[PDB]
Design an enzyme around this catalytic site. Structure first.
Site, mmCIF file in Angstrom:
data_model
loop_
_atom_site.group_PDB
_atom_site.id
_atom_site.type_symbol
_atom_site.label_atom_id
_atom_site.label_comp_id
_atom_site.label_asym_id
_atom_site.label_seq_id
_atom_site.Cartn_x
_atom_site.Cartn_y
_atom_site.Cartn_z
ATOM 1 N N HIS A 87 -5.828 0.266 15.318
ATOM 2 C CA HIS A 87 -5.638 -0.526 14.118
ATOM 3 C C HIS A 87 -5.244 -1.898 14.630
ATOM 4 O O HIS A 87 -4.053 -2.115 14.955
ATOM 5 C CB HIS A 87 -4.499 0.040 13.263
ATOM 6 C CG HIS A 87 -4.161 -0.787 12.042
ATOM 7 N ND1 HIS A 87 -3.264 -1.841 12.070
ATOM 8 C CD2 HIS A 87 -4.524 -0.645 10.741
ATOM 9 C CE1 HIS A 87 -3.142 -2.354 10.855
ATOM 10 N NE2 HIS A 87 -3.905 -1.648 10.027
ATOM 11 N N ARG B 160 -12.337 1.972 13.821
ATOM 12 C CA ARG B 160 -12.121 0.720 14.478
ATOM 13 C C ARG B 160 -11.799 1.042 15.915
ATOM 14 O O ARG B 160 -11.012 1.956 16.205
ATOM 15 C CB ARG B 160 -10.876 0.056 13.882
ATOM 16 C CG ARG B 160 -10.906 -0.073 12.378
ATOM 17 C CD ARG B 160 -11.996 -1.023 11.980
ATOM 18 N NE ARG B 160 -12.002 -1.095 10.519
ATOM 19 C CZ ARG B 160 -11.332 -2.018 9.859
ATOM 20 N NH1 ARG B 160 -10.686 -2.952 10.580
ATOM 21 N NH2 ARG B 160 -11.346 -2.036 8.524
ATOM 22 N N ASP C 89 -7.155 3.731 1.137
ATOM 23 C CA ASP C 89 -6.044 4.187 1.948
ATOM 24 C C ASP C 89 -5.548 5.530 1.409
ATOM 25 O O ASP C 89 -5.666 5.782 0.224
ATOM 26 C CB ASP C 89 -4.912 3.165 1.832
ATOM 27 C CG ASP C 89 -5.207 1.933 2.624
ATOM 28 O OD1 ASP C 89 -5.948 2.029 3.666
ATOM 29 O OD2 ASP C 89 -4.767 0.882 2.163
ATOM 30 N N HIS D 58 -10.173 4.132 4.762
ATOM 31 C CA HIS D 58 -10.020 2.849 5.447
ATOM 32 C C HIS D 58 -9.112 3.136 6.650
ATOM 33 O O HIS D 58 -8.125 3.910 6.513
ATOM 34 C CB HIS D 58 -9.320 1.852 4.486
ATOM 35 C CG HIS D 58 -8.737 0.664 5.179
ATOM 36 N ND1 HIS D 58 -7.386 0.351 5.142
ATOM 37 C CD2 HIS D 58 -9.327 -0.300 5.933
ATOM 38 C CE1 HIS D 58 -7.182 -0.754 5.850
ATOM 39 N NE2 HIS D 58 -8.333 -1.151 6.359
ATOM 40 N N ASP D 59 -9.451 2.558 7.808
ATOM 41 C CA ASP D 59 -8.759 2.798 9.073
ATOM 42 C C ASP D 59 -8.493 4.276 9.293
ATOM 43 O O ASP D 59 -7.340 4.640 9.517
ATOM 44 C CB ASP D 59 -7.412 2.011 9.142
ATOM 45 C CG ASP D 59 -7.586 0.556 9.554
ATOM 46 O OD1 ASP D 59 -8.484 0.274 10.370
ATOM 47 O OD2 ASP D 59 -6.819 -0.313 9.044
HETATM 48 O O1 LIG Z 1 -7.785 -6.030 8.490
HETATM 49 C C1 LIG Z 1 -8.959 -6.180 7.652
HETATM 50 C C2 LIG Z 1 -9.205 -4.912 6.831
HETATM 51 O O2 LIG Z 1 -8.999 -3.721 7.664
HETATM 52 C C3 LIG Z 1 -10.620 -4.984 6.171
HETATM 53 O O3 LIG Z 1 -10.893 -3.854 5.347
HETATM 54 C C4 LIG Z 1 -11.735 -5.228 7.243
HETATM 55 O O4 LIG Z 1 -13.066 -5.209 6.759
HETATM 56 C C5 LIG Z 1 -11.505 -6.595 7.862
HETATM 57 O O5 LIG Z 1 -12.532 -6.993 8.772
HETATM 58 C C6 LIG Z 1 -10.161 -6.477 8.585
HETATM 59 O O6 LIG Z 1 -9.928 -7.640 9.356
#
Ligand SMILES: O[C@H]1[C@H](O)[C@@H](O)[C@H](O)[C@@H](O)[C@H]1O
Ligand SMILES: [Cl-]
Length: 303
Positions: A80, A67, A281, A30-31
Site C-alpha cells: 500500500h 498494488r 474498502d 480497493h487495496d
Molecule cells: O492512493 C490512490 C487510491 O488508492 C486510488 O484508488 C488509486 O487509483 C490512485 O492511483 C492512488 O494513488
C-alpha cells in the site's frame, strides 16, 4: 431476486455466459492485500480490508485491486504505497488459481499497478518483471486469460484471471489496457479514456481525495450514468474508497462503514440496473441493520 447474493461463492456461474464482463456488475476490493495489516497505528488509514483473498472471493469479490512494488528482479511484493503488506504477488495468484479451480464458471479481474519505487537492487522495469516472472510464468500456465478479444465474455474468461493493466504500456496482449499505450489514468478525477486500441471506452470515478459529501456525489453520479447505459463497449469502474476518511471520519474503516451502506441503499432503491464495477474498502464487512454493498452489487445483476 435475493437469490444471487445468498450464495456469493458461485454467483457468476448463474449468469448468461454470453454477457461481456463489462456488462456484469462486479464487486471489487480497493487495496485488496491490505488485510495483512495488524499494526494499529499503521492500520488507521492504510488498512482497507479485513478478509484474506480467498475469504473475499468466497464473499463474492471478483475485481481485485493489487498494488505492487518490484522488490527483486524476479519478484513483486504487494504494497500500500510505501507500506509492505507482507506477501508477494504469487500468494494472490495461488489463491485465485485455487478458487477458479473450485468454481470454473467464475472469472476474476485482477488490476495490477506499480504502487512504490523498486528496491535499489532492482534493475528491470515493473512491467518486465510482471510480464516475465508472472504472466509468462509456466507455473501460471492456464491461469490468465490469453485471448485476443478486447471485450471478452464470461464464456471466454471462465476460470481465468483477466488482467486490468494499470502498469502503463505493456507487451502483454490480453486483458483491459493490454497494449503499448496502457491506460491513461487521471489523478483524483472522474474521467473517460479509450483503451485496447480504441475498442473500449473506460469511464472511471477515482476521486480519491474527495471530502466525504463530494465523494458520495461522485459515486452516485457515475452510478446514474451506468444506469441508463446498455453499451457493452463502455466499462465503468467506480471507486467507493477514499483517502483520509473523506476528511470526515477518523479511519478508513469508519469511513467505509458510512459510504458502503449509503451506496448499497442507493443501488437497492434503483432496482436491478447496470452499476458497473464498484471497488470498495472493507468488502464483505457487514454492519447489523445496514445494507451490504457487495451483496447489493451482486443482486443488481438481472437474471
Ligand atoms: O492512493 C490512490 C487510491 O488508492 C486510488 O484508488 C488509486 O487509483 C490512485 O492511483 C492512488 O494513488
Ligand atoms: Cl502490520
Amino acid at each position: 431476486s435475493d437469490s444471487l447474493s445468498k450464495s456469493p461463492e458461485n454467483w457468476m456461474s448463474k449468469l448468461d455466459d454470453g454477457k461481456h464482463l463489462t456488462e456484469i456488475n462486479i464487486p471489487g476490493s480497493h487495496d485488496s492485500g491490505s488485510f495483512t495489516l495488524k499494526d494499529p497505528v499503521k492500520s488507521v488509514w492504510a488498512k482497507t480490508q479485513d478478509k484474506d483473498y480467498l475469504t473475499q472471493m468466497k464473499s463474492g469479490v471478483r475485481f481485485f485491486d493489487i498494488r505492487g512494488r518490484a522488490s527483486a528482479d524476479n519478484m513483486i511484493s504487494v504494497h500500500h504505497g510505501m507500506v509492505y503488506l507482507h506477501h508477494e504477488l504469487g500468494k494472490f495468484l495461488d489463491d485465485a488459481k485455487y478458487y477458479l479451480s473450485a468454481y470454473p464458471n467464475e472469472t476474476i479481474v485482477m488490476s495490477m499497478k506499480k504502487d512504490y519505487d523498486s528496491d535499489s537492487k532492482v534493475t528491470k522495469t515493473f512491467e518486465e518483471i510482471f510480464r516475465e516472472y508472472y504472466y509468462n510464468n509456466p507455473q501460471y500456465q492456464n491461469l490468465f486469460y490469453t485471448g485476443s478479444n478486447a471485450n471478452p465474455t464470461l464464456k471466454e474468461t471462465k476460470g481465468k484471471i483477466v488482467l486490468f493493466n494499470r502498469m502503463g504500456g505493456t507487451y502483454i496482449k490480453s486483458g483491459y489496457g493490454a497494449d503499448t499505450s496502457g491506460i491513461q489514468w487521471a489523478d483524483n478525477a472522474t474521467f473517460e479514456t479509450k483503451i485496447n486500441n480504441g475498442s473500449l471506452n473506460l469511464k472511471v470515478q477515482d476521486e480519491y481525495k474527495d471530502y466525504y459529501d463530494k465523494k458520495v456525489e461522485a459515486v452516485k453520479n457515475l452510478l446514474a450514468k451506468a444506469k441508463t447505459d446498455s453499451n457493452k463497449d463502455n466499462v465503468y469502474v467506480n471507486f467507493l474508497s477514499v483517502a483520509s476518511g473523506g476528511s470526515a471520519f477518523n479511519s478508513t474503516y469508519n469511513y467505509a462503514s458510512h459510504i458502503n451502506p449509503e451506496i448499497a441503499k442507493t443501488i437497492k432503491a434503483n432496482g436491478k440496473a447496470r452499476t458497473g464495477w464498484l471497488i470498495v474498502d472493507y468488502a464483505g464487512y457487514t454492519w447489523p441493520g445496514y445494507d451490504d454493498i457487495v451483496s447489493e452489487i451482486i443482486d443488481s445483476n438481472k437474471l
